[PDB]
Design a protein around this motif. Structure first.
Motif, PDB file in Angstrom:
ATOM      1  N   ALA C  36       0.809  -1.211   0.000  1.00 58.50           N
ATOM      2  CA  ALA C  36       0.000   0.000   0.000  1.00 58.50           C
ATOM      3  C   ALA C  36       0.846   1.267   0.000  1.00 58.50           C
ATOM      4  CB  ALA C  36      -0.921  -0.005   1.205  1.00 58.50           C
ATOM      5  N   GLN C  37       1.931   1.252   0.768  1.00 60.36           N
ATOM      6  CA  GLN C  37       2.831   2.381   0.862  1.00 60.36           C
ATOM      7  C   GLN C  37       3.541   2.557  -0.460  1.00 60.36           C
ATOM      8  OE1 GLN C  37       5.759   2.043   4.151  1.00 60.36           O
ATOM      9  NE2 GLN C  37       3.990   2.052   5.570  1.00 60.36           N
ATOM     10  N   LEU C  38       4.155   1.480  -0.929  1.00 56.79           N
ATOM     11  CA  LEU C  38       4.892   1.519  -2.176  1.00 56.79           C
ATOM     12  C   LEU C  38       3.982   1.899  -3.329  1.00 56.79           C
ATOM     13  CD1 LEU C  38       7.268   1.306  -3.819  1.00 56.79           C
ATOM     14  CD2 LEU C  38       6.998  -1.164  -3.958  1.00 56.79           C
ATOM     15  N   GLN C  39       2.711   1.525  -3.231  1.00 58.73           N
ATOM     16  CA  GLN C  39       1.759   1.872  -4.269  1.00 58.73           C
ATOM     17  C   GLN C  39       1.675   3.397  -4.322  1.00 58.73           C
ATOM     18  OE1 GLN C  39      -0.820   1.623  -6.612  1.00 58.73           O
ATOM     19  NE2 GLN C  39       0.492  -0.111  -7.225  1.00 58.73           N
ATOM     20  N   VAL C  40       1.411   3.995  -3.166  1.00 53.90           N
ATOM     21  CA  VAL C  40       1.286   5.442  -3.061  1.00 53.90           C
ATOM     22  C   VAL C  40       2.578   6.135  -3.443  1.00 53.90           C
ATOM     23  CG1 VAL C  40       0.443   7.284  -1.642  1.00 53.90           C
ATOM     24  CG2 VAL C  40      -0.217   4.943  -1.164  1.00 53.90           C
ATOM     25  N   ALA C  41       3.686   5.498  -3.111  1.00 53.88           N
ATOM     26  CA  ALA C  41       4.984   6.041  -3.452  1.00 53.88           C
ATOM     27  C   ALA C  41       5.099   6.090  -4.978  1.00 53.88           C
ATOM     28  CB  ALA C  41       6.063   5.152  -2.881  1.00 53.88           C
ATOM     29  N   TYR C  42       4.584   5.038  -5.632  1.00 56.29           N
ATOM     30  CA  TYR C  42       4.614   4.900  -7.091  1.00 56.29           C
ATOM     31  C   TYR C  42       3.704   5.929  -7.714  1.00 56.29           C
ATOM     32  CZ  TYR C  42       4.796   2.292 -11.593  1.00 56.29           C
ATOM     33  OH  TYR C  42       5.019   1.846 -12.890  1.00 56.29           O
ATOM     34  N   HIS C  43       2.508   6.039  -7.172  1.00 62.47           N
ATOM     35  CA  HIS C  43       1.590   7.012  -7.707  1.00 62.47           C
ATOM     36  C   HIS C  43       2.251   8.386  -7.699  1.00 62.47           C
ATOM     37  CE1 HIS C  43      -1.215   4.017  -8.283  1.00 62.47           C
ATOM     38  NE2 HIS C  43      -2.196   4.381  -7.479  1.00 62.47           N
ATOM     39  N   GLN C  44       2.679   8.823  -6.513  1.00 60.67           N
ATOM     40  CA  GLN C  44       3.323  10.128  -6.312  1.00 60.67           C
ATOM     41  C   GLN C  44       4.541  10.349  -7.210  1.00 60.67           C
ATOM     42  OE1 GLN C  44       4.100  10.207  -1.948  1.00 60.67           O
ATOM     43  NE2 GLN C  44       1.952  10.863  -1.588  1.00 60.67           N
ATOM     44  N   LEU C  45       5.351   9.309  -7.366  1.00 66.60           N
ATOM     45  CA  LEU C  45       6.512   9.421  -8.235  1.00 66.60           C
ATOM     46  C   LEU C  45       5.970   9.596  -9.654  1.00 66.60           C
ATOM     47  CD1 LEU C  45       9.269   7.114  -9.313  1.00 66.60           C
ATOM     48  CD2 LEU C  45       9.068   9.596  -9.363  1.00 66.60           C
TER      49      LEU C  45
ATOM     50  N   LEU D  68      -3.403  -1.388 -17.122  1.00 66.09           N
ATOM     51  CA  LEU D  68      -2.814  -0.373 -16.256  1.00 66.09           C
ATOM     52  C   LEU D  68      -2.480  -0.961 -14.898  1.00 66.09           C
ATOM     53  CD1 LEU D  68      -4.888   2.822 -16.995  1.00 66.09           C
ATOM     54  CD2 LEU D  68      -2.471   2.408 -17.414  1.00 66.09           C
ATOM     55  N   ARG D  69      -3.427  -1.687 -14.320  1.00 58.12           N
ATOM     56  CA  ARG D  69      -3.185  -2.278 -13.030  1.00 58.12           C
ATOM     57  C   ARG D  69      -2.524  -3.634 -13.144  1.00 58.12           C
ATOM     58  NH1 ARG D  69      -9.467  -3.251 -11.937  1.00 58.12           N
ATOM     59  NH2 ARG D  69      -9.743  -5.252 -13.050  1.00 58.12           N
ATOM     60  N   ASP D  70      -1.989  -3.972 -14.310  1.00 59.15           N
ATOM     61  CA  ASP D  70      -1.376  -5.285 -14.484  1.00 59.15           C
ATOM     62  C   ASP D  70       0.018  -5.182 -15.098  1.00 59.15           C
ATOM     63  OD1 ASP D  70      -4.145  -6.329 -13.722  1.00 59.15           O
ATOM     64  OD2 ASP D  70      -3.543  -8.141 -14.785  1.00 59.15           O
ATOM     65  N   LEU D  71       0.210  -4.228 -16.007  1.00 52.98           N
ATOM     66  CA  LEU D  71       1.506  -4.044 -16.660  1.00 52.98           C
ATOM     67  C   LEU D  71       2.200  -2.739 -16.251  1.00 52.98           C
ATOM     68  CD1 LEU D  71       0.576  -5.234 -20.286  1.00 52.98           C
ATOM     69  CD2 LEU D  71       1.295  -6.578 -18.329  1.00 52.98           C
ATOM     70  N   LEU D  72       1.424  -1.681 -16.044  1.00 60.69           N
ATOM     71  CA  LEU D  72       2.010  -0.419 -15.624  1.00 60.69           C
ATOM     72  C   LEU D  72       1.928  -0.233 -14.118  1.00 60.69           C
ATOM     73  CD1 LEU D  72       1.169   2.033 -18.437  1.00 60.69           C
ATOM     74  CD2 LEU D  72       2.766   0.116 -18.301  1.00 60.69           C
ATOM     75  N   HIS D  73       1.005  -0.945 -13.488  1.00 62.63           N
ATOM     76  CA  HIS D  73       0.856  -0.872 -12.045  1.00 62.63           C
ATOM     77  C   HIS D  73       0.298   0.468 -11.558  1.00 62.63           C
ATOM     78  CE1 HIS D  73       3.069  -4.649 -11.812  1.00 62.63           C
ATOM     79  NE2 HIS D  73       3.944  -4.125 -12.652  1.00 62.63           N
ATOM     80  N   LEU D  74      -0.688   1.006 -12.262  1.00 64.08           N
ATOM     81  CA  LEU D  74      -1.296   2.254 -11.851  1.00 64.08           C
ATOM     82  C   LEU D  74      -2.718   1.943 -11.488  1.00 64.08           C
ATOM     83  CD1 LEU D  74      -0.141   4.391 -14.837  1.00 64.08           C
ATOM     84  CD2 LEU D  74       0.781   4.495 -12.526  1.00 64.08           C
ATOM     85  N   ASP D  75      -3.173   2.378 -10.326  1.00 60.59           N
ATOM     86  CA  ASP D  75      -4.556   2.110  -9.969  1.00 60.59           C
ATOM     87  C   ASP D  75      -5.464   2.902 -10.890  1.00 60.59           C
ATOM     88  OD1 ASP D  75      -7.209   2.470  -8.891  1.00 60.59           O
ATOM     89  OD2 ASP D  75      -6.431   1.620  -7.004  1.00 60.59           O
ATOM     90  N   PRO D  76      -6.241   2.221 -11.733  1.00 60.08           N
ATOM     91  CA  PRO D  76      -7.140   2.915 -12.652  1.00 60.08           C
ATOM     92  C   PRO D  76      -7.890   4.082 -12.032  1.00 60.08           C
ATOM     93  CG  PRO D  76      -7.142   0.632 -13.158  1.00 60.08           C
ATOM     94  CD  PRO D  76      -6.440   0.769 -11.826  1.00 60.08           C
ATOM     95  N   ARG D  77      -8.404   3.891 -10.819  1.00 56.51           N
ATOM     96  CA  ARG D  77      -9.142   4.948 -10.131  1.00 56.51           C
ATOM     97  C   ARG D  77      -8.251   6.168  -9.936  1.00 56.51           C
ATOM     98  NH1 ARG D  77     -13.552   2.853  -9.104  1.00 56.51           N
ATOM     99  NH2 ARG D  77     -13.989   0.672  -8.485  1.00 56.51           N
ATOM    100  N   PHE D  78      -6.997   5.921  -9.602  1.00 54.04           N
ATOM    101  CA  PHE D  78      -6.061   7.004  -9.394  1.00 54.04           C
ATOM    102  C   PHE D  78      -5.788   7.772 -10.672  1.00 54.04           C
ATOM    103  CE2 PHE D  78      -1.561   8.153  -9.855  1.00 54.04           C
ATOM    104  CZ  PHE D  78      -1.557   9.236  -9.002  1.00 54.04           C
ATOM    105  N   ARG D  81      -8.746  10.096 -11.394  1.00 56.46           N
ATOM    106  CA  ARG D  81      -8.784  11.370 -10.669  1.00 56.46           C
ATOM    107  C   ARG D  81      -7.651  12.290 -11.117  1.00 56.46           C
ATOM    108  NH1 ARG D  81      -7.561   9.908  -5.168  1.00 56.46           N
ATOM    109  NH2 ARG D  81      -7.499   7.659  -5.646  1.00 56.46           N
ATOM    110  N   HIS D  82      -6.519  11.689 -11.449  1.00 55.98           N
ATOM    111  CA  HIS D  82      -5.362  12.437 -11.901  1.00 55.98           C
ATOM    112  C   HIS D  82      -5.641  13.105 -13.242  1.00 55.98           C
ATOM    113  CE1 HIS D  82      -1.261  13.486 -12.919  1.00 55.98           C
ATOM    114  NE2 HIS D  82      -1.336  12.749 -14.013  1.00 55.98           N
ATOM    115  N   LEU D  83      -5.958  12.295 -14.245  1.00 59.17           N
ATOM    116  CA  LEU D  83      -6.229  12.804 -15.579  1.00 59.17           C
ATOM    117  C   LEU D  83      -7.361  13.809 -15.617  1.00 59.17           C
ATOM    118  CD1 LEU D  83      -5.812   9.719 -17.893  1.00 59.17           C
ATOM    119  CD2 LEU D  83      -4.372  11.751 -17.797  1.00 59.17           C
ATOM    120  N   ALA D  84      -8.100  13.925 -14.525  1.00 65.28           N
ATOM    121  CA  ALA D  84      -9.206  14.862 -14.503  1.00 65.28           C
ATOM    122  C   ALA D  84      -8.792  16.202 -13.939  1.00 65.28           C
ATOM    123  CB  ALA D  84     -10.346  14.300 -13.696  1.00 65.28           C
ATOM    124  N   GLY D  85      -7.547  16.300 -13.490  1.00 66.39           N
ATOM    125  CA  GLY D  85      -7.082  17.554 -12.931  1.00 66.39           C
ATOM    126  C   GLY D  85      -5.871  18.097 -13.654  1.00 66.39           C
ATOM    127  N   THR D  86      -5.657  17.649 -14.886  1.00 64.86           N
ATOM    128  CA  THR D  86      -4.521  18.106 -15.676  1.00 64.86           C
ATOM    129  C   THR D  86      -4.949  18.232 -17.114  1.00 64.86           C
ATOM    130  OG1 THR D  86      -3.556  16.137 -14.642  1.00 64.86           O
ATOM    131  CG2 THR D  86      -2.043  17.824 -15.478  1.00 64.86           C
TER     132      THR D  86
END
Lengths: 165, 58, 59, 172
Positions: C36-45, D68-78, D81-86
């Motif tokens: 969970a932490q590393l996830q957020v760290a990744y998001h932020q990065l 995204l949540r499988d190869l790039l590892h980005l939470d789709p929900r995130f 919200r991100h793409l909606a503020g840029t």
């Protein structure tokens, strides 16, 4: 938000570390205080001059490999090999200065503060000499002499290697 | 011999969930492991990006 | 006679496992936290990198 | 190492996703093959014109929240919200096209595919809205500076609702 990470870093950054860090980022401040430190960092962030990969090496050079790993989530062993393949956001001048600062022992430092309207730490010295336009990335003869006044030929020869010839 | 069967059957339900649990732990780690590699990768990309965006001409 | 003592040997061993599943669940949370932490760290990065590109083309 | 990812993405895409993605990257290829697809993306990473942040919205735009949540590892929900503020890496034109591209139903496409076929300049006749768009661009008939030909294809297909949206997305 992500500004909290920069705080936790300062908050855990050692006393002498605050000077090393601030020196590397060119926002030097003698024996700063948390408020002052975090204040400085925060400013470098809002401007965009303090980037994650910068704060990263910045902390790596500072020696806080533990902060790098637990706060930034990077493997210092990894970053070492990485840094050993890039340009380093820091000049070979700063890297030499930081080298010296680290090699100077109690005697030397205690003596330097003596032999010297104020300093109280080697980075404080270099800071002033920098304002007095005596020391700079251009010429380090002053820093080269300072090491002669303290019997640190081994050092003066090291600074000599990291720069001229 | 029934109170025992009521145990061997209960205790077995445990060792079962403990096996399923141990299994998940292995997958999750695989997951963490990827994200760490992901993180470093982003880092390496972001870094090189900055160092490459530094160049002036005419 | 010893059917009672035959129960203790089954009871005590049962818990011995129930504890392991309990301990296992703990470490399982210690790791859930790491991710969970590393996830957020990744998001932020991620965001900081995103924003950096955006600011290089505009100016 | 990294190209291992760009490949796994390319080969997990979709016969359609490939055109969407290539469209979004200002690099189109009618009904491409994993070979041509990769070769294209790969040439984009080898020149720094394919930054993780982009490749990410590309997939988000392509609706592949999965990759995204499988190869790039980005939470789709995130990323949502991100793409909606840029500001997007893609132009209003692009984001408009993809909009239409997804709304058209079979009865629309099958029709467009026919209604065209004798497109001047075309070198293949198109079997895809994007394929059509491509062909239209290659004639200076479409583009952001002027989408009045896109509106026409729409009002002819009886999707005046899209004509309106397209007219809203772009203005006037």
């Amino acid at each position: 938000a992500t500004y909290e990470v920069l705080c936790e870093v300062a908050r855990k950054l050692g006393t002498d570390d605050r000077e090393v860090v601030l020196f590397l980022l060119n926002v030097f401040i003698p024996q700063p205080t948390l408020a002052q430190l975090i204040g400085a960092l925060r400013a470098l962030k809002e401007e965009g001059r303090l980037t994650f990969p910068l704060l990263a090496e910045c902390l790596f050079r500072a020696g806080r490999r533990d902060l790098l790993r637990d706060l930034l989530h990077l493997d210092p062993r990894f970053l070492e090999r990485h840094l050993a393949g890039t340009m380093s956001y820091f000049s070979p001048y700063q890297l030499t200065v930081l080298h010296v600062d680290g090699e100077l022992c109690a005697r030397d430092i205690r003596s330097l503060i003596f032999l010297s309207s104020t300093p109280q730490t080697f980075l404080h010295w270099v800071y002033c000499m920098e304002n007095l336009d005596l020391l700079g990335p251009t010429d380090v003869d002053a820093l080269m002499s300072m090491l002669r006044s303290l019997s640190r030929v081994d050092l003066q020869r090291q600074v000599q290697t990291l720069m001229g010839l | 011999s029934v109170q025992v069967d009521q145990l061997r059957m209960q205790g077995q339900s445990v060792e079962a969930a403990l096996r399923m649990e141990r299994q998940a732990a292995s997958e999750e780690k695989r997951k963490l492991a990827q994200l760490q590699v992901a993180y470093h990768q982003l880092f390496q990309e972001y870094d090189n990006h900055i160092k490459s965006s530094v160049v002036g001409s005419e």
